[PDB]
Amino acid sequence: NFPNSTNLPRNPSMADYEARIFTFGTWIYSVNKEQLARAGFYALGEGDKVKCFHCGGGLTDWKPSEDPWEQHAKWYPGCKYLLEQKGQEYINNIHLTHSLEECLVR
Amino acid sequence: MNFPNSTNLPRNPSMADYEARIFTFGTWIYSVNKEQLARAGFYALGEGDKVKCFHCGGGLTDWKPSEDPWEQHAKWYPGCKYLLEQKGQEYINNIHLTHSLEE
Numbered sequence: 001n002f003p004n005s006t007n008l009p010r011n012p013s014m015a016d017y018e019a020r021i022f023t024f025g026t027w028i029y030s031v032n033k034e035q036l037a038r039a040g041f042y043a044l045g046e047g048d049k050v051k052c053f054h055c056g057g058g059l060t061d062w063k064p065s066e067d068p069w070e071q072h073a074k075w076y077p078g079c080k081y082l083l084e085q086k087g088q089e090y091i092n093n094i095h096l097t098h099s100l101e102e103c104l105v106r
Numbered sequence: 107m108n109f110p111n112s113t114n115l116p117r118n119p120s121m122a123d124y125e126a127r128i129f130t131f132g133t134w135i136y137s138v139n140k141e142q143l144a145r146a147g148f149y150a151l152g153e154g155d156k157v158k159c160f161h162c163g164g165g166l167t168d169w170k171p172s173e174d175p176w177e178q179h180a181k182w183y184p185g186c187k188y189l190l191e192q193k194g195q196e197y198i199n200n201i202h203l204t205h206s207l208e209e
């Protein structure tokens with residue numbers, strides 16, 4: 001249940017962009033499948049459910065406003081694919097953003 | 107806010123002092139030590155053995171005697187910046203490899 005924060009991926013079968021792209025197939029949900037594959041995610045085949053090949057972290061119910069890489073950071077901040085690809089400079093923006101997002105509206 | 111804080115500012119700054127966090131436990135006779143939990147940034151909710159990190163907001167429960175506060179902090183809230191400040195990524199990584207080698 002806990003997410004992988006090691007530097008080795010949990011599903012190395014899904015480590016190649018093409019392997020991940022194939023899992024979606026015809027994809028009808030609001031959020032783009034190339035965008036999701038680039039962000040590490042492959043598809044389960046149960047609705048819009050996706051999983052990061054590295055952290056194992058899963059997400060669902062994608063709104064059009066929700067960005068793969070942004071959601072990757074929100075829920076799986078320990079991911080090492082995330083850190084390798086966007087780098088803690090970016091990752092900290094999201095979190096301040098996402099915390100500050102909540103203080104305004106309340 | 108279900109998602110955990112990975113900013114460098116704590117979520118509950120009222121619980122940022124050790125003496126604050128420890129005062130929440132009171133008489134505590136769950137299996138795992140309350141000073142150990144407070145040092146690891148946890149304070150008590152008062153609903154069983156439920157605790158919360160003052161920084162990440164990350165919550166845990168049902169403490170086995172085998173389960174260590176700092177180890178569980180890393181397992182479930184690896185993005186915590188109190189965790190990173192206090193143990194460093196050197197520690198944090200071995201403890202992940204140790205969990206991920208079990209799983």
Ligand SMILES: C[C@@H]1CN(CC(=O)N2CC(C)(C)c3ncc([C@@H](O)c4ccc(F)cc4)cc32)[C@@H](CN2[C@H](C)COC[C@H]2C)CN1
Nearest residue numbers: 044049050051057058059060061062063066067071075108
């Ligand atoms: C794109 C966003 C993602 N949000 C978060 C989300 O999807 N999370 C959060 C979290 C990490 C607690 C979580 N754990 C499990 C699932 C589960 O379904 C799943 C299991 C295995 C998989 F391989 C894929 C998915 C999902 C999931 C959405 C908000 N979420 C959802 C509606 C789930 O319920 C909580 C609520 C706050 C909005 N859209």
Ligand SMILES: C[C@@H]1CN(CC(=O)N2CC(C)(C)c3ncc([C@@H](O)c4ccc(F)cc4)cc32)[C@@H](CN2[C@H](C)COC[C@H]2C)CN1
Nearest residue numbers: 001151155156157158164165166167168169170173178182
């Ligand atoms: C000491 C360990 C902790 N484990 C993990 C655990 O406590 N987690 C995992 C996680 C992060 C998904 C999670 N999210 C919510 C709670 C919730 O209760 C809570 C909310 C707010 C609080 F302020 C305090 C607690 C807890 C919790 C235990 C294993 N856990 C538990 C039994 C919870 O259910 C899942 C299962 C795998 C073993 N003991």
Ligand SMILES: [Zn+2]
Nearest residue numbers: 052054055079
């Ligand atoms: Zn990941």
Ligand SMILES: [Zn+2]
Nearest residue numbers: 159161162186
């Ligand atoms: Zn924490």
